[PDB]
């Protein structure tokens, strides 16, 4: 059992990666192949 504020931070960072990094990494990588 980790504190609630620490659990919140971990989830928020993973939420962020999903909305930001993971949404664009593949398409950007694929776009640069055909550039």
């Amino acid at each position: 059992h980790m504190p609630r504020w620490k659990r919140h931070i971990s989830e928020q960072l993973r939420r962020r990666d999903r909305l930001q990094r993971q949404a664009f990494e593949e398409i950007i990588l694929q776009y640069n192949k055909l550039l």
Binding site: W5, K6, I9, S10, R15, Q20, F24, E25
Partner: protein, 265 residues
């Protein structure tokens, strides 16, 4: 655990679309260039491929010191990429639309970046200033020159382990103490004259109790508790211990850059 948080902060990326400014003298129209920018790093350190891209369509006489702007605002390169985005564009839709410029450098808004040595010096100036607040410079001064170089190469080469093998020493503190002397933080806000707020703040109180994020904010910027408190693209609880944040959610420069932005709609 705590290490997974370090890795997630370190490997944070921001999808970005670099478009060439339309008034740049070019032999042909250039295509927009997409790139995943590292949050923890600097524009003039990670955009070599971008510079090469837009220079293919330009004469050697037309090129100069490159610079970037978002929505008219010149992007200060010495501010970490993640901070710039959280402060300026986190409200807008992805990807980050950055406009690439060459001609007409804004002398009064940005600091020139003549070399990658200029970036290293600035990065080191932030670390040494941080350790001055945390340990009265004691920890960072007792390192060999090779350790300073490794900290830099770790950031430049995106090597988490290489970087943290040295940076771990800067997060230590006396056993008799429960944190650093002062916490290195800079609070940014778009609707203020000052570039940022940086004051002396102790992580522990008279009781030996840990000050929270909220405690810091109530002290140095109470006009933020309607507004959003963002660090590394996330909004941590106000009850979060400041000492832990400083150890885990700081940028590689050992500073805790905090964005105060209006709540979107």
């Amino acid at each position: 655990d705590d290490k997974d948080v370090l890795r997630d902060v370190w490997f944070g990326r921001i999808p970005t679309c670099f478009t060439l400014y339309q008034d740049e003298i070019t032999e042909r129209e250039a295509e927009p260039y997409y790139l995943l920018l590292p949050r923890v790093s600097y524009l003039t350190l990670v955009t070599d491929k971008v510079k090469k891209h837009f220079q293919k369509v330009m004469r050697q006489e037309d090129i100069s010191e490159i610079w970037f702007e978002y929505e008219g605002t010149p992007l200060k390169w010495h501010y970490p990429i993640g901070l710039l985005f959280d402060l300026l564009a986190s409200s807008s839709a992805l990807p980050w639309n950055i406009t690439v410029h060459f001609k007409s450098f804004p002398e009064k808004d940005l600091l020139h970046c003549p070399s990658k040595d200029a970036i290293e010096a600035h990065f080191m100036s932030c670390m040494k200033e941080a350790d001055a607040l945390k340990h009265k410079s004691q920890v960072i001064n007792e390192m060999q020159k090779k350790d300073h170089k490794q900290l830099w190469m770790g950031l430049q080469n995106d090597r988490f382990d290489q970087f943290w093998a040295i940076n771990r020493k800067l997060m230590e503190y006396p056993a008799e103490e429960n944190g650093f002397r002062y916490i290195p933080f800079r609070i940014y806000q778009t609707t203020t004259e000052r570039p940022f707020i940086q004051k002396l703040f102790r992580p522990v109180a008279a009781d030996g109790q840990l000050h929270t994020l909220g405690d810091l904010l109530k002290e140095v910027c109470p006009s933020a508790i309607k507004n959003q408190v963002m660090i590394h693209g996330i909004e941590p609880m106000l009850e979060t211990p400041l000492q832990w944040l400083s150890e885990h959610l700081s940028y590689p420069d050992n500073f805790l850059h905090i964005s105060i932005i209006p709540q979107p709609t």
